Scaffold this active site. Sequence first.
Site, PDB file in Angstrom:
ATOM      1  CG  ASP B  25     -21.683   9.968 -12.493  1.00 36.78           C
ATOM      2  OD1 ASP B  25     -20.711   9.833 -13.237  1.00 36.78           O
ATOM      3  OD2 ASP B  25     -22.734   9.377 -12.684  1.00 36.78           O
ATOM      4  CB  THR B  26     -15.970  12.504 -13.209  1.00 30.90           C
ATOM      5  OG1 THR B  26     -15.809  11.059 -13.482  1.00 30.90           O
ATOM      6  CG2 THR B  26     -15.560  12.984 -11.825  1.00 30.90           C
ATOM      7  N   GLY B  27     -18.746  11.040 -14.886  1.00 34.81           N
ATOM      8  CA  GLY B  27     -19.243  10.489 -16.127  1.00 34.81           C
ATOM      9  C   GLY B  27     -20.495  11.218 -16.598  1.00 34.81           C
TER      10      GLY B  27
HETATM   11  C1  LIG Z   1     -21.604   2.405 -16.890  1.00 31.65           C
HETATM   12  C2  LIG Z   1     -22.217   1.507 -15.821  1.00 31.65           C
HETATM   13  C3  LIG Z   1     -21.224   0.472 -15.334  1.00 31.65           C
HETATM   14  C4  LIG Z   1     -23.452   0.804 -16.398  1.00 31.65           C
HETATM   15  O1  LIG Z   1     -22.610   2.237 -14.636  1.00 31.65           O
HETATM   16  C5  LIG Z   1     -23.535   3.264 -14.691  1.00 31.65           C
HETATM   17  O2  LIG Z   1     -24.181   3.547 -15.671  1.00 31.65           O
HETATM   18  N1  LIG Z   1     -23.551   3.895 -13.520  1.00 31.65           N
HETATM   19  C6  LIG Z   1     -24.343   5.087 -13.214  1.00 31.65           C
HETATM   20  C7  LIG Z   1     -25.044   5.039 -11.827  1.00 31.65           C
HETATM   21  C8  LIG Z   1     -26.135   3.980 -11.780  1.00 31.65           C
HETATM   22  C9  LIG Z   1     -26.080   2.932 -10.879  1.00 31.65           C
HETATM   23  C10 LIG Z   1     -27.078   1.924 -10.877  1.00 31.65           C
HETATM   24  C11 LIG Z   1     -28.130   1.999 -11.783  1.00 31.65           C
HETATM   25  C12 LIG Z   1     -28.234   3.080 -12.669  1.00 31.65           C
HETATM   26  C13 LIG Z   1     -27.237   4.067 -12.638  1.00 31.65           C
HETATM   27  C14 LIG Z   1     -23.499   6.363 -13.312  1.00 31.65           C
HETATM   28  O3  LIG Z   1     -24.264   7.518 -13.557  1.00 31.65           O
HETATM   29  C15 LIG Z   1     -22.505   6.257 -14.515  1.00 31.65           C
HETATM   30  N2  LIG Z   1     -21.940   7.586 -14.856  1.00 31.65           N
HETATM   31  C16 LIG Z   1     -22.743   8.078 -15.980  1.00 31.65           C
HETATM   32  C17 LIG Z   1     -22.054   7.760 -17.277  1.00 31.65           C
HETATM   33  O4  LIG Z   1     -21.692   6.429 -17.449  1.00 31.65           O
HETATM   34  C18 LIG Z   1     -22.938   8.096 -18.501  1.00 31.65           C
HETATM   35  C19 LIG Z   1     -22.021   8.197 -19.714  1.00 31.65           C
HETATM   36  C20 LIG Z   1     -22.909   8.065 -20.958  1.00 31.65           C
HETATM   37  C21 LIG Z   1     -23.435   9.260 -21.483  1.00 31.65           C
HETATM   38  C22 LIG Z   1     -24.296   9.132 -22.598  1.00 31.65           C
HETATM   39  C23 LIG Z   1     -24.577   7.870 -23.146  1.00 31.65           C
HETATM   40  C24 LIG Z   1     -23.999   6.726 -22.629  1.00 31.65           C
HETATM   41  C25 LIG Z   1     -23.156   6.795 -21.491  1.00 31.65           C
HETATM   42  N3  LIG Z   1     -23.660   9.302 -18.277  1.00 31.65           N
HETATM   43  C26 LIG Z   1     -24.936   9.331 -17.955  1.00 31.65           C
HETATM   44  O5  LIG Z   1     -25.740   8.395 -17.855  1.00 31.65           O
HETATM   45  O6  LIG Z   1     -25.310  10.719 -17.836  1.00 31.65           O
HETATM   46  C27 LIG Z   1     -26.644  11.082 -17.411  1.00 31.65           C
HETATM   47  C28 LIG Z   1     -26.864  10.504 -15.980  1.00 31.65           C
HETATM   48  C29 LIG Z   1     -26.718  12.618 -17.266  1.00 31.65           C
HETATM   49  C30 LIG Z   1     -27.789  10.571 -18.250  1.00 31.65           C
END
Ligand SMILES: CC(C)(C)OC(=O)N[C@@H](Cc1ccccc1)[C@H](O)CNC[C@@H](O)[C@H](Cc1ccccc1)NC(=O)OC(C)(C)C
Lengths: 99, 99
Positions: B25-27
């Site tokens: 996950d590059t996110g």
């Molecule tokens: C954006 C979306 C379409 C809602 O998909 C996910 O969130 N997908 C999750 C996987 C998942 C699947 C099913 C259920 C729950 C989680 C990935 O970690 C997405 N990459 C993470 C990234 O979006 C996010 C960026 C971010 C950072 C801070 C605030 C808001 C957004 N980082 C993220 O959650 O990083 C940590 C996991 C370390 C908390």
Amino acid sequence: PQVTLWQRPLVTIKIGGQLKEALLDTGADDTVLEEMSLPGRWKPKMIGGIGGFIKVRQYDQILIEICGHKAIGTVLVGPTPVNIIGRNLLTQIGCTLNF
Amino acid sequence: PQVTLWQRPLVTIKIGGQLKEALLDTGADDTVLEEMSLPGRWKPKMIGGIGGFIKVRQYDQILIEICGHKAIGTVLVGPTPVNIIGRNLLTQIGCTLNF
Ligand SMILES: CC(C)(C)OC(=O)N[C@@H](Cc1ccccc1)[C@H](O)CNC[C@@H](O)[C@H](Cc1ccccc1)NC(=O)OC(C)(C)C
């Protein structure tokens, strides 16, 4: 390009001659953009992320340009802190993870 | 290898003698794993994702094998729907985004 992960992978997007900053997220299945008014009908949807769900509005067939590479597809619009380009769009621009 | 994103970028990791599947996950800035009993001294932490905050146990200096590549760093253990390999470890293994 070849984007390194030393820093968050934030790029410029153009969504109607609007330059926008967005994160290339391989972890995201879907594309989530900050609240914006797009012309067109949308479908209500709830998407889950770490932490819980958020309510979003779904738009079909939006065109976005990622480093001057076009992609057309579904985008969810809601109160995210950051624009997230998901795999639905990244597959279009020929994005791969290499190690 | 060269991972395409037509599907979720799921890889098998080896951690604490356990083989698990995790998303590249590059996110994500950090690596968050499903509940597990790893050996060592941990510190509670809170981290936020798109749906809000979660409480995790932070474990430092942990060895993890990703597709046979070695990485040693921080791992957050907590209530996540999937194991996620973040940017702290993807940089260690030399992963890039390419298009
Ligand atoms: C954006 C979306 C379409 C809602 O998909 C996910 O969130 N997908 C999750 C996987 C998942 C699947 C099913 C259920 C729950 C989680 C990935 O970690 C997405 N990459 C993470 C990234 O979006 C996010 C960026 C971010 C950072 C801070 C605030 C808001 C957004 N980082 C993220 O959650 O990083 C940590 C996991 C370390 C908390």
